[PDB]
């Protein structure tokens, strides 16, 4: 009733009532419950992921600041890791969804003194974050549904 009444002040509120179709049948209810079936393990896993990304951010901020220039125009640089908070947000927001790791969103380390360290950094990030943890997070929900 409250949502229906609020619908008169702004029409789009009526869209909320569409959620009534979500619980209308057994299959959709099962799909919705599959998420909350294993909540505790999911929360702990995402916390572990956050901790690992924080460690990677610490290392990157200490050693690899020069490779985080996102500006294509000279005389107007856009540093992403001159602060710990900005670097951490960049790692959690762009790196996780990259699909290939953080290595395909920063500068090419070819010809640099720190080339091998950068290669190991990229490979280890790709292996630990993308391949393993995301797969476990997805598999928990899929197995619960099954």
Ligand X SMILES: CC(C)c1c(C(=O)Nc2ccccc2)c(-c2ccccc2)c(-c2ccc(F)cc2)n1CC[C@@H](O)C[C@@H](O)CC(=O)O
DSSP type of residue 10: S
Q: Which does 20 bind (CB under 5 to 8 A by kind): ligand X, a copy of itself, none?
A: ligand X
Residue 38 CA to residue 140 CA, distance in Å, equals 7
How many other CB atoms are found less than 10 A from the CB of residue 56?
21
Please say which residue, 45 or 69, places its beta carbon nearer to a copy of itself: 45
Q: Binding pattern to a copy of itself, positions 72-91, x when CB under 8 A?
A: ------x---xxxx--xx--
Q: Which partner, a copy of itself, ligand X, none, binds residue 24 by CB below 5 to 8 Å per kind?
A: ligand X
* DSSP per-residue letters across 26-77: HHHHHHHHHHHTTHHHHHHHHHHHHHHHHHHHHHHHHH-GGG-B--SSTTS-
- The contact mask relative to ligand X for 4-43 (x = CB under 6 A, - = no) is ----------------xx-xxxx-------------x--x
Give contact residues for ligand X (rule: CB under 6 A): 20-21, 23-26, 40, 43-44, 46-48, 50-51
């Amino acid at each position: 009733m409250v949502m229906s009444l609020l619908g008169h002040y702004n029409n789009f509120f009526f869209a909320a009532h569409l959620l009534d179709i979500a619980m209308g049948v057994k299959t959709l209810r099962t799909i919705l419950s599959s998420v909350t079936h294993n909540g505790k393990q999911l929360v702990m896993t995402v916390g572990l992921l956050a901790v690992v990304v924080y460690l990677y951010t610490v290392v990157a901020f200490n050693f690899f600041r020069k490779f985080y220039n996102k500006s294509e125009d000279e005389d107007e640089p856009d540093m992403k890791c001159d602060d710990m908070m900005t670097c951490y947000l960049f790692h959690m927001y762009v790196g996780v969804r990259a699909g290939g790791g953080i290595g395909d969103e920063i500068e090419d380390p070819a010809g640099d003194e720190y080339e091998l360290y950068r290669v190991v950094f990229d490979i280890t990030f790709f292996f630990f974050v993308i391949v393993i943890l995301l797969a476990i997070i997805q598999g928990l929900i899929i197995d619960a549904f099954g």
